[PDB]
């Protein structure tokens, strides 16, 4: 009878809210900030850890740590702080009266999911829980039942093909190139113009620059020729303390690492070749249905040139007699949460929750038999 | 007073409909498809088994099984599913208000016919039923009363000679080389050009290639020399996912196994030698009447070179003073069903049905004494 | 002074040895096996043709051909191979130093005997050669001078009556129904239980099943009722590759074609009616002497129910005041060879040999004037 | 008079040497490594491509490509580099003074063999060459003349039955599941414990882990329960840079794809069912001789549990009255080369070489008429 | 034919000389001194700018400015004065008859290199020039071909790993903590004992104190406990105008900022953690070769405790099964110049010079293409 909770815990953003809602109520950066300087004035309330937007608003005196790196949780006390801020401070609800739905990247370690279930059932003890694949939730929010999903966020870019509600786990392909790698590459290439960013507070500034000013070029070499010829692609950004920086080709050299990973020295292929290899790893008779239903999700797929570039690259890779369609909804930044809210509100989902007595009888192993 | 049903249950196609009609209403492939992958999307209607054209339209996530192999039913639950789909889903009628006429290849096991009678009288309990030889139905649909019928379908190629309505059971010859063996030989020889088809879904693609592009050469060695000299016999086929394949001699090397079974390592002779030996096993005074009435039936005899090749081979085998005629009607793919509809509509057939009280008094043994 | 050779060349077994011996030294199947597959290993000595027991021991890669069909030699190069294997490989003697006695079925073509004489005198050139009727040799081996002989082997079942050493050629009957026809009928009726045998190697397996497990029922309808009531007549046979088959009425439905030829669609009467009609075709005053001396010979008369069945059928056909005796010795499988060894060792036989100068002066026509 | 060369060009290892030798002199991995980073130091000799063990010793800065994928050569310049390294750098001989024997997988494209002949006669122009089936060479090195060979290497697992030097091409089965697929599955399942291997250099590390630590379980469910109960099957491996990884059930979950291909989403059956279906596709009278001569060859059959598991599975599949023997010699990793050295040293093989004038007269089509 | 010039223009020292020499002839501090007082007496030569050792010898009446700050040239007229003093006053040669090799820190602005090329080709116009990375020259002077170089000078501390002559640009790390920052930290912490230094002339005195008296402690806490317990680590320095100062823990608190940057409020990690992260950012198979070839260069590595401390910290960070070696040659203060002299004397380098016609055709953009 109670309302379930949907909490997408991504590598860079935590999106939590109630099932049945259209948009998540709490979208906050998953960071933990700790003071790196000395406190000299007594009386003022100084906490040992700042979580969420409070870490963002005070980041000039804080070291910021991400509890999740490449979809894998590394710090568990910081992850508990993120979950406590999500439940008690943002959603303002008691977790013991609400089932919680959580998301997880494919090809993740088992101990991550086991410790997630242990924390959900022993520290924030819920009546029930479930762990779902993010690309299945993206396909749920897309409204269709078939297609291949490229979900790229802050740590993980994964392609999962699903045909008529049936997933193909041998064709699920995961690449560890996402928005944090693009932010680091933008930091590396911003030193060519004389702008130096080294701190974790400056990481958020470079990430804001990447969110506001970067775009995907349709043709890379033509865009470098255009940038070298005239200064028409140069854009200006205002730093928080007063300086104005100007960037040229670095607007489109940063997300080009999504298509050319050798910019950061990785042997893997681009996201278009990842999608094509995931499609050709499937059975033949479904491949056409995977060609016309390329579903994009995640914030990293929110550059305003990525759909046409993906369409062009897959059309160059696929045979010319096949129709290529890239599904890029405007709400695809939060589509994992929207699909989780759709899934948790279904009447055919209520018997597939992992309840507390099943956890007590099974221990940290039920989540590998009731979830994928 | 009620209309009888005619259901030709072949090894690769089920053709069911009403007696007195010219064409069968329901022609669907006799396959049962089961999901070989995992289901990840709840709420979507996913059945445990897909039967008929639904298995064909979703074959990329299904393992397809044929319930009938070489004219013998191996899986009986799958055959019950086939009959349930044929009666309730395709013909949309209740089987308890309609007598059902079924077909059977000659020299079949007795347990197949006994279990067919048991399922038709205890699961789909009919007022009456009859089991008929398919070649007699092909002769009924041909409109003549004498001739030797070569019926070749998906599992069984059988020659049955009938003179003036009298069948000769000692000259009935059965060969287990038909369209599925030709399809498997086509998947074997398609690897010479670099095309790999190993799944059961790809077997349907190879079967479609064989149906659309294969033909019987009039002279095999001359066609081999023509295909080796110039690329004029090469044809292109578009795969369901986009690739275009090209085949040369494999258009006529595939049905040449009908005339040279040693292509698949079988000691038996070709269909022309089978027909000639079946004619030579009969009485001499009827042999001329069997020479001018060679009736072709079944889908495997639907290649556009098989009538002239059979005429040439039998004319080479028979003495030159006798007239050889191959009767190949354009409707011979469904001629067993057409002859079943002709036989079931006859007024002289209504007393030869096996009714329910006769089955109750005799048990599963009446069909060996009321049918041949 | 030299020892003569006796070589019974039957349709399914060649039995060769020396005159004066009690049992033939070389009893081997008259088959020629040729490889139907491709040879991939070099150095391993692979012959083009395998003859005799070597063809039986390697029959899984060989097509086996019988040079003699229904008592008539159809392949003469294969018959040369059979005779060469009989002389040089089995008997290990030079044919030019030994006269050879051969057997032949009655009512045979004259060209068969003429070509036999030509091959014996120009390829395996003997000092002398004689051709004898097999039933006269069976009467020689029986030790009596009167009686009617039913000799049934692999191709020919013939009845020959002889009274006091005088044969009656107008009462000699020949029927082309023997052990190979029974093997083909068992091959046909084994498909009712789901066992499929189609190759020439499997024909030898069915022949072994017929030799080991088949028997002649005393009353056919009573045995049908007994087999239909209880499964007490069912016997199990172990196949060469591991399967165990079980047969019921087919143990006695197979040799019942000897008494009911209409099982294989032949208008001729059974062996008992052939024997009775051969007896009543003779003179009346000898008929009683033919009633008490029914001599059985050949392997086809080796079923363990045939003597009592023949006695019952002839006693039903003959008048009740005549004594009917069926002479079935245990050595009747080789009795033609035993009578040939008896005849060739006689001192009154040495001037009825056809020598080489008589063949040189007369050509291939002496065998019609010195032999019957 | 000159010594012939035997060069087994497998999908993952090239084994080249002289005819008449017991072990191949040059066993090197068939990879071509190219630098993926930039070169900053001049004077140091930096080649554009590293072939063989030099690519293995410098793989941390190289992208490694296999010229042969699933037994089919995809890159021909890289295969020319492989052959040049095999002839000039490893064997240290001139190919124009030595005939060369090559091996090839069954059911391969014809263009692969034609181009193999073309490069062997026009770039490394030999006096003569021959292309042989690898399973025939494995049976040659086994010392026997009959048996069914399961040869599983890096790309191709094929079953070929040969009886008395006669192969059965209709029973030859090819499956595209071998050691590279097992290596990719081990990279897939190594992410469950937190170990990430995505580069081509790390694929060699995972292949070394699979070679050193993996084994075939006799019972899969019992071994899974044993691994889940206690940590007695866990083994530790030292990475090349210092970390120690520990694996549990993944020691036997990796080669279980050989018996359960559905672990990588493939519809085909396991190697034991493939062997049983290849035996049952043969003639019956040879099947017992195929039951006791199961010959294992290739490196993929080098797990220390595969012979007992294959024996158990085939004994469960075969009837209990047949003796099942799995022939697994300790030298079966190089047995294709050993059989090639045996075949090339035979005196009966010297006339079956394809010489240079025959190739000049016939063009690149003689290899389909002088080889199988 | 003419001798090339090697000019390492560091942030605090300019080292210029001829190619092929072992030691640089001109090592002078890169400062420009300007008079801050009033000249009251006339006649003798008082220059407006004093460059080099003349600025050091008269620093009591001069304000000293560094033209290079953190590896980036800020004052270009002062840099032209530095280059003019290096060419015409120290080396006493004409720059128009000698090619010049220049060094540059990694991750530097492009405009610095472009203006360097413009000044060297338009003000001190050379026949040819080249810009090289300092760490590649340090690896050249070390004599080895692999290893990771930590080059720490006056403005830039950078780690560059090179494996077999191939650099990895994604693992190159730059930290703006070097000898000038340590000098400023010593200027800050010298006020605790009552010694006040505020002027630019006193900064050279504090730099001399840091060069003569400072050392790296092996254990920091034990050394602070030893300094707090007894005054055994206290050392005395004589000021240029007479006073004697004594320092205690400040001998090892100053270079500890190299390992603990939080002493000057910097969020970055120490040089040992930077080296370990640069090794861990590389591929796995080269990391062991980077563990045993840690190459130190620059004057900031001239403390007589830094090699053992770096060995201890990396051995604590790396796994214990790896060998850690810190290569610290005694000539590593000038090793960038030594490697430049080695590189400029190579015969394989003479075609990679950027000549004057290429500069005239390309303008200020060729140096980003012919150099890294
Ligand atoms: N407008 C935008 N353009 C480009 N990148 C964006 C934009 N908005 C967000 N991102 C990137 O998306 C990443 C997070 O996306 P999302 O998948 O929604 O969160 P998470 O990865 O935490 O699940 C961030 O690293 C951010 O850099
Ligand atoms: N036009 C065609 N050309 C060649 N083969 C065909 C054609 N149409 C059908 N077939 C083959 O005929 C087989 C089935 O024939 P049919 O006798 O009608 O069905 P069934 O064998 O199930 O009774 C199929 O395997 C199919 O491959
Ligand atoms: N024990 C037996 N029972 C039944 N039939 C047998 C037996 N032994 C042999 N036969 C049959 O006898 C035939 C051959 O008999 P025989 O006359 O001795 O040889 P041939 O006919 O070659 O002269 C064979 O076809 C075989 O099937
Ligand atoms: N001891 C071993 N255990 C398991 N697998 C092995 C072993 N040795 C080799 N292999 C596998 O065998 C494959 C190659 O086997 P082989 O047939 O000798 O070479 P190729 O396939 O190139 O002809 C390699 O992929 C390797 O992973
Ligand atoms: N013996 C020494 N002990 C400590 N530091 C030194 C020593 N010698 C030089 N340095 C420091 O090294 C720095 C310059 O080193 P170097 O790299 O040779 O010059 P540059 O940085 O100008 O290229 C100076 O700032 C100086 O403080
Ligand atoms: Mg996400
Ligand atoms: Mg049919
Ligand atoms: Mg006989
Ligand atoms: Mg191999
Ligand atoms: Mg320096």
PDB file of C-alpha atoms in Angstrom, chain A residues 36-37 62-64 188 191-194 196 199-201 264-265, chain E residues 107-111 169-170 172 174 176 262 265-268 283:
ATOM      1  CA  UNK A  36      41.238  20.497   3.994  1.00  0.00           C
ATOM      2  CA  UNK A  37      42.082  23.698   5.909  1.00  0.00           C
ATOM      3  CA  UNK A  62      36.598  21.197   0.712  1.00  0.00           C
ATOM      4  CA  UNK A  63      38.208  18.154  -0.833  1.00  0.00           C
ATOM      5  CA  UNK A  64      35.468  16.386  -2.797  1.00  0.00           C
ATOM      6  CA  UNK A 188      44.224  18.016 -19.909  1.00  0.00           C
ATOM      7  CA  UNK A 191      46.274  23.656 -20.388  1.00  0.00           C
ATOM      8  CA  UNK A 192      47.092  24.341 -24.053  1.00  0.00           C
ATOM      9  CA  UNK A 193      45.468  27.788 -23.815  1.00  0.00           C
ATOM     10  CA  UNK A 194      47.088  28.632 -20.476  1.00  0.00           C
ATOM     11  CA  UNK A 196      45.303  25.535 -15.208  1.00  0.00           C
ATOM     12  CA  UNK A 199      41.946  20.869  -7.637  1.00  0.00           C
ATOM     13  CA  UNK A 200      38.773  18.860  -7.081  1.00  0.00           C
ATOM     14  CA  UNK A 201      36.835  22.130  -6.838  1.00  0.00           C
ATOM     15  CA  UNK A 264      42.940   9.222 -23.746  1.00  0.00           C
ATOM     16  CA  UNK A 265      45.075   6.250 -24.792  1.00  0.00           C
TER      17      UNK A 265
ATOM     18  CA  UNK E 107      51.487  20.144 -20.627  1.00  0.00           C
ATOM     19  CA  UNK E 108      52.671  23.716 -21.413  1.00  0.00           C
ATOM     20  CA  UNK E 109      50.663  26.370 -23.312  1.00  0.00           C
ATOM     21  CA  UNK E 110      51.054  26.323 -27.085  1.00  0.00           C
ATOM     22  CA  UNK E 111      51.590  30.097 -27.281  1.00  0.00           C
ATOM     23  CA  UNK E 169      50.888  11.014 -23.023  1.00  0.00           C
ATOM     24  CA  UNK E 170      47.814  10.076 -20.971  1.00  0.00           C
ATOM     25  CA  UNK E 172      52.143  12.264 -18.123  1.00  0.00           C
ATOM     26  CA  UNK E 174      52.518  17.811 -14.185  1.00  0.00           C
ATOM     27  CA  UNK E 176      53.442  23.039 -10.062  1.00  0.00           C
ATOM     28  CA  UNK E 262      49.342  20.391   2.038  1.00  0.00           C
ATOM     29  CA  UNK E 265      47.837  24.398   1.088  1.00  0.00           C
ATOM     30  CA  UNK E 266      47.815  22.383  -2.143  1.00  0.00           C
ATOM     31  CA  UNK E 267      45.279  19.618  -2.723  1.00  0.00           C
ATOM     32  CA  UNK E 268      47.597  17.555  -4.944  1.00  0.00           C
ATOM     33  CA  UNK E 283      49.386  -0.493 -19.403  1.00  0.00           C
TER      34      UNK E 283
END
